[PDB]
Design a protein around this ligand. Sequence first.
Ligand SMILES: C=C1[C@@H](O)[C@@H]2O[C@]3(CC[C@H](/C=C/[C@@H](C)[C@@H]4CC(C)=C[C@@]5(O[C@H](C[C@@](C)(O)C(=O)O)CC[C@H]5O)O4)O3)CC[C@H]2O[C@@H]1[C@@H](O)C[C@H](C)[C@H]1O[C@@]2(CCCCO2)CC[C@H]1C
Ligand SMILES: [Mn+2]
Ligand SMILES: [Mn+2]
Length: 293
Amino acid sequence: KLNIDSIIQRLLEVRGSKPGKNVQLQENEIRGLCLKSREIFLSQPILLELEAPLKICGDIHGQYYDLLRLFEYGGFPPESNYLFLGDYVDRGKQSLETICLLLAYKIKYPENFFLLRGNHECASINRIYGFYDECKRRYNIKLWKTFTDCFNCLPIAAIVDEKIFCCHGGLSPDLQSMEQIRRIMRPTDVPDQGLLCDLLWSDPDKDVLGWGENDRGVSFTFGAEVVAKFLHKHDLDLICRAHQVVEDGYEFFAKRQLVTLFSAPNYLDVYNNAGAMMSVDETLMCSFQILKP
Ligand SMILES: C=C1[C@@H](O)[C@@H]2O[C@]3(CC[C@H](/C=C/[C@@H](C)[C@@H]4CC(C)=C[C@@]5(O[C@H](C[C@@](C)(O)C(=O)O)CC[C@H]5O)O4)O3)CC[C@H]2O[C@@H]1[C@@H](O)C[C@H](C)[C@H]1O[C@@]2(CCCCO2)CC[C@H]1C
Ligand SMILES: [Mn+2]
Ligand SMILES: [Mn+2]
């Protein structure tokens, strides 16, 4: 009953309009996007096994027109396949248009479009950093809770061609086998510290080789040795994550065993960072497409 094509049409109708122009979908349409995508998320693994070619994107944080710029540069679905690493809402001015377009494409192209969970796809987080307020203003809190129920079902990681491990934050001192991830049950809010918490919040740190203290006030930091042990144990070549703002949109850490992607140019209007998107072809060759602010 949900008219996906009309929703997409209206959402894309603003590409070319003055940045900031809102697209106000009906409440029933947004709830449908949430309920239908949730079903698909639960129907697919929590640890996705994808194949190149694919375009991987980092944080978007409600910068809708920048999301439109990414698609125009990388190709609107289904021209290209996409994998987003999380943090779709909060901070930006248009989290609603942003998340709705993404859910809409997930429903429209369930086998060629994927979305991972970021720490901002968490109630306790998006309640404070913007999304809740945006829903309260343009719609209502009940709709916000519907979004939360959808987010609690997002997959947590993906492996591209058995070589690239993708997640939002990073590793966990609790992560020993890939099975541990695959066994995580949904829906789930992340109520306790531990594996899922770390996957959503950890960061690589240049100072320590093993495990360190995280300035975020949650989770930990991990060094090059930790990364090395992980990659070899699971026969992987690289970790692709997001979660941290980087100047060039992308940046390597842990002696190039990990790459961080961030796709929200000029973050919060304060940073003058660029946004980036990483393209991976069938020859498992990695390439970066930058998006200047
Ligand atoms: C969000 C965050 C963290 O990520 C953030 O990490 C730190 C370390 C590095 C990071 C810096 C980021 C900068 C680049 C940006 C640039 C701009 C312009 C603004 C700003 O924006 C930050 C938030 C946000 C969203 O914009 C982000 O970019 O991260 C806050 C500091 C701001 O100067 O910094 O700041 C320290 C402050 C910390 O503050 C909150 C943190 O308190 C959240 C807290 C840990 C949570 O705890 C709970 C309980 C425990 C388990 C987890 O859930 C409940 C929910 C919530 C209260
Ligand atoms: Mn994050
Ligand atoms: Mn983020």
